[PDB]
């Protein structure tokens, strides 16, 4: 029965995503903005992929952090193969794609995630954030805007939807996404892929810094 | 064997002798040496004739494939690296007598300043590769004798003209010091072959060019 | 029931084929016309395959980007191994023929997608541009003149169908392409053409400004 | 449950080939005559497999190229292996058969079509034609004057036992073949010609196609 | 379950056999000899597996080929490893017997066939004839006198039954295998092993000179 | 079901061996003595497998002697690897019991059979005869008379039960053994036996005349 | 061994020796080194007779394996293609003695102008290809001879029979000067084999006319 | 070892010596050197024995299983493929001094001109093979003397008799300036084998009639000894 | 080493000495070299000791594991073929110094007349065997003068025991001549050792027979 299988695999997963916790990503005028509701102090729902590309995600964390791994793998080989500019956040977002297109398809259990890949410009170079959202049968889509993941998302979306205006700070943007968040710092993980900074975009915003920010 | 390449403000130019040889013999007249590898890019292989075709010949063909598959060209620094790949690769075989070099000369479309976006590379055996900053490299068996003779002419490179112009002059110096590097041939009309780069891409030189720049050199020593 | 399974099957890949966002490729005077409604700036439904063979998809991307990266593999593996002229619209057509046949019949799912190869002349040649069409169950044609694929195709099919002309121009043929689509902007279509006029790699995008103007 | 497995996919593949255009192959005076129906300005299901041995395919393309293509690879190899005169048709239906054989059983669909394998004498020998019909189960048959497959075929073939008469010529058997075809830039013709020193496969295209009619 | 797998398996073999051509092998003064209706001229059913050992089937053609095949690759691999006068009748049925057994267990389908391996004294020597009979399931069996293979048997068993006797000349068996076959020439496929023969007992007898015998 | 599975498998297998005809081993004077209902000119359901160890079996001949090769297999190759004397009559039956009971647990279809290997002293030890029954699920036994193995068993076996014999003689034995097979001719059975005053082999067939004789 | 290939106005000819050694001792009086690999090819092989046989034989059924397969012939470039990976792959035993050169001719039906389609295209023991540009080339212990001879002999080439006269002619001197190159035999009437390609396809040249223009050759020295 | 084959009208004959040599030792003196490969063929091997032996046995199992296996015979140029194959597989070991060089006759019943039907072809180390069209070959250590032998006497060939004597009569040759050829050994009886092969299949030649034209060669060679200086 | 064999009416008889050298040094004085294969067939093998023996057990174990299988033993050609096949086997190891060569004998009862039942095969180091036709061989470092004192002898074979003393003289005279042979040593008792077959199968020779046959060989020789 391929059409009943398909419906629960997907019907499995959308759930296992539904009981999670909620992660936030969008554009602003330095760089991208990671912020993700987070309890624990050890474990990360966001991270660096590349030099401009960064990482996030939602649902069961050791199936995500697997396809964390794995993307890190393939950016520092496809890197170390051509060169480090030669890596980018389309080519992370497409090989999720089809990764995760694969896993939905022959394996035992489909995972239950939803993945967000983000790139800024090089440093002193112009250039519009980018963001991309793969989905647990691979299905992708870049949002111009903003990306939400996880639980409840259209409580989350409009919030955001209505609260967004891209080229916003760093601080006004923080806001607008913990308050979309809240539609549906200890319980925060937050993080930005900063445009100015020269190589290394991804840094971490934690402790008193961030709490400055809130 | 002689190929050469130089820097001009704004570009790049290569350019290459035409002889083959099997020891003392003349086996070619009419090699080309010098190939557009993409619309930035040339190369020019010296050593063992079968292996700097293979070379060029797939070292294109892995660049356009880049191009499709990604949607975009490789960065020049990976396509440096790629060519030092397969350098790197041949190193057991060039030890048996399959030795080639290539000679890597672009025009960076990504470079910040245009007028120096003009790229030479060359490479070692081992695939060891370094970016030429002084403006000029050759390789191949007459590669010293060119280099000498394009260190006291290059001060004259001040467009792509007269880098053609010098580029010319330096494979005649290599022809008149390195019997395996063959001159202008004005019987059979044979002249060496040269590529130019600049920001509007990778263009062959007109034979009918060459051969005027070779005339006059020989007229000139004359 | 093996009957059914593949009457499952077909459904399962037309339902996702169906719910896609439309593609047309249509003959012109100056070589081939690719058009597909598409939002994104950087996910792409129209690619270069070789010198003068063209692709355009429909349905899951993921899967015929897939396909598409093949179809690069094998295009510049037969060239490398023979030479360049010896790669055609033909053979590619047959190859994902035959691989989306087996995937069809092998494979956990179908593909939810639908193929366009397109081939021009060489330059300085004189041959009549070939379009094929693949679908997910390893089904091929070649239409003489235009090939619509994704969502609901009979619409734009038959739009299509009255409105065209051979020998169009490239500002035409666009009008007709759109005018179809829509019949069942820039920062929503994807453009491209396989121009016989340039001299090795026909493919080039139709994008920016260039675009506006031709609409 | 074998027994019900095997009359699914026995159906299935039947099926297949109910709905796909009809090809004939009949022997001719001349050799071997190949006429299918066929609009396609790209696609053959007629095709050369070796010197004197053609190949016919009615039913689903990309499954019977695939086929076509196998036994290229075959004859060509068997040919190279030994010499080219130890490759026959009675060898290229047997390979079809086995191969056939295994899709049928451990496959996941069996390949919906119906093959004909054919050959004519060497250039100057004398010997009668051989026509070989191999179907989707790997079956076997050879037919001493003619093959029909594709579609809906006692029609056809009905008509071509009357309409059979052995040494008809290739216009003769040719309208023959074309009639039970019914029972020309959208039909594709061929001969494997014994009138030829090697290559007998040879297409009969465009204007030479009407003439002969 | 496990008796409906050996029952279903068991009937498709038997059916495949039953509607198939008829084949029967019969001892006679001078040998062996093999008769089966065959309309083709082309598509053999009876053949030479080694020295003195012939072989017979009847079923699918396509499998029976396969296994005689693979008897051929069988003895010729035994004799070069071995000697050749070390390949017998008996060690052939032996293997088709595992073959069968085999195949009828682990294969997708059991192989419609059933096959009769027949060996002949050496030139000179003086031996009994050996016919052995193998079924789709691997049961083996060497009959004294004569085999019936393909289609229905019994008919032709039962008219065979009638009229055999050993020693009987070659145009008797000849004669008498035809009937046997009829009651169930461009249109037979004939051989023997004729014990005569110095090396190689196979040879087919075609055209005239079969007519002759009839 | 699995066990229920593996109940029908086990009936499956018991009904090949039913259908089968019998086959008879027993300890006698002079060695094991090994007698089958067998009419075939040329395929055997007893074998030598070693020095002093013999092989009996019932069922489907190509499965049977598939064992038999696999036992001879065995022992040739452990003799050959240790020494002669190392090979006994309780290491190929462990043996067949751990090979039939993978095949009854792994294989598509058990096999059909039920296998009896037999030993007999070396030249001049004085030792009992062994004899070991092993079936088709791998279980293992060791009788210290006689085995019964193929088609209906019980009344060959109770028959045998009331006129067996210790140090019975070879031509009283057997036909003992040919009566109990009764029960339940020269041209009808197969006959051997392990010969413990060999010196070595102890395998030999009891054919033609001299069975004749023995028939007497 | 020689082999010969030139190019006349509208296509080529190809012509062999028969000679066959095993050190100093002839070992073969006919053997056949020139073959019609398909309709618009040749191919002369020189060396290791037992690999040169090998390569023409595979090498044709390759080519025709693609057309079957594809429905089309290949590209003459992809012709050339296949025939250098052919040798390149040889070159291990090469080295060990199974050495192997062809020598390639052919009529492109494709190319444009078609008094320029002939083809001729020399081969390196690496693999390496020439498509040679000076109207013909030459292959085998005696090549150096006949290429000389033909040197000087080639602008009476106007057509096929002039071509294959000075293909004749330059065998004849190979032979000559060349111990390992056969001669044409008088008291045998074995003569050199020869391969004639134009428009029309590849047509082997009868026995006679190549024993005519031997004759002739000879009395002419005479 | 010599080992020659020639051409008759109908016809091939292949005939070889019986000596076995450990360097300067003979080691055999009735070594069968030339083989009946199918009804129309015979081949005959010189080199290293154990080798030669092989090849021989390994050719004829192959050429009989390609037959039962597709129920018709290789054609001749099959059968020549066949066997260069085998000869090149044997390179690598052949350098290392396990060489075996076959020589191949037949008859081809497919040919054209039956009187012409006959086959002779040689081979090389490497399998290069090739199809004699002068009538005569020879292989082994004795062939270059054999050859000229029949240089000189092939015009007497005119039938299978004449031919067989010609083929003895270059053994003989072959063996009076070859210690590594055995030349007909009257005292024990032992002569070279020949193999006859025409329309009607091939053939053992009888020892008796290979005596005889041995002794007659050799009363022959007495008489004109005498008769010159 | 040396071993012997010869041909009697109606059997065979082979014998061998019972000396072990590591290089001049004798390391064994009763090594038994001659086996029982099985009923009919009979094994010597010469060199190196540790793979001679292998060689006789794993044969023999081949011969009965054939015959256990099949229920019948195998031809007498296929022993051959099987001996011949491990020899080969064992090529490499012999150039490295593990050279084992056999001598075979046997009474083939499927052979056509009794009286000429009875077989001898000899086997060079490549595998290669030979069916002795002149009724006697010998294989070891004394084989030659074994072979050369049963020419001399054979004459005289008209029996078993006669054959016997034959084959003991024969070695006696190895001996003789090879230090690596050992003659008959009186001292201790020590004697060749030797198997007879015939129609009843093969029988070990018993001790005291060859020594009586030794000290009459020794006294005719004093």
């Known amino acids: ?214 | 064997t002689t190929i050469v390449a130089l820097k001009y403000p704004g570009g790049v130019v290569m350019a290459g002798d035409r002889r083959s040889t099997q020891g003392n013999m003349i086996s070619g007249r009419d090699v080309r040496k010098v190939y557009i590898t993409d619309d930035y890019t040339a190369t020019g292989i010296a050593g063992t004739a079968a292996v700097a075709v293979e070379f060029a010949r797939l070292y294109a063909v892995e660049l356009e494939h880049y191009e499709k598959l990604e949607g975009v060209p490789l960065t020049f620094a990976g396509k440096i690296n790629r060519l030092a790949i397969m350098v790197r690769g041949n190193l057991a075989a060039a030890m048996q007598g399959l030795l080639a070099l290539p000679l890597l000369a672009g025009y960076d479309i990504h470079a910040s300043d245009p007028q120096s976006a003009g790229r030479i590379v060359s490479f070692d055996a081992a695939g060891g590769w370094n970016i030429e900053e002084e403006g000029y490299q050759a390789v191949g068996s007459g590669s010293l004798f060119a280099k000498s003779s394009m260190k006291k002419l290059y001060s004259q490179v001040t467009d792509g003209d007269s880098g053609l112009r010098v580029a010319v002059e330096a494979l005649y110096d290599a022809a008149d010091d390195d019997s395996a590097t063959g001159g202008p041939d004005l019987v059979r009309g044979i002249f060496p072959t040269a590529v130019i780069i600049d920001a509007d891409g990778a263009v062959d030189v007109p034979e009918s060019r060459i051969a005027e720049l070779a005339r006059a050199i020989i007229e000139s020593r004359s």
């Open chain 1, 1 to 214: 029965s391929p059409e009943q299988a398909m419906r629960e695999r997907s019907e499995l997963a959308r759930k296992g995503i539904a009981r999670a916790k909620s992660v936030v990503a969008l554009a602003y005028a330095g760089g991208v903005l990671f912020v993700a509701e987070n309890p624990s102090r050890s474990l990360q729902k966001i991270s660096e992929l590349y030099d401009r590309v960064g990482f996030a995600a939602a649902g069961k964390f050791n199936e995500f952090d697997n396809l964390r791994r794995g993307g890190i793998q393939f950016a520092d080989t496809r890197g170390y193969a051509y060169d480090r500019r030669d890596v980018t956040g389309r080519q992370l977002a497409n090989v999720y794609a089809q990764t995760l297109g694969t896993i939905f398809t022959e394996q035992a259990k489909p995972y239950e995630v939803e993945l967000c890949v983000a790139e800024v410009a090089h440093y002193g170079e112009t250039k519009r954030p980018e963001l991309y959202r793969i989905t647990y049968d691979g299905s992708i889509a870049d949002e111009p805007h903003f990306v939400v993941m996880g639980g409840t998302t259209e409580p989350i979306a409009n919030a955001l939807k209505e609260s967004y205006a891209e080229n916003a700070s760093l601080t006004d943007a923080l806001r607008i996404a913990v308050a979309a968040l809240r539609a549906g710092v200890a319980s925060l993980e937050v993080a930005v892929l900063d445009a100015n900074r020269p190589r290394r975009a991804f840094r971490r915003i934690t402790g008193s810094a961030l709490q400055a920010l809130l």
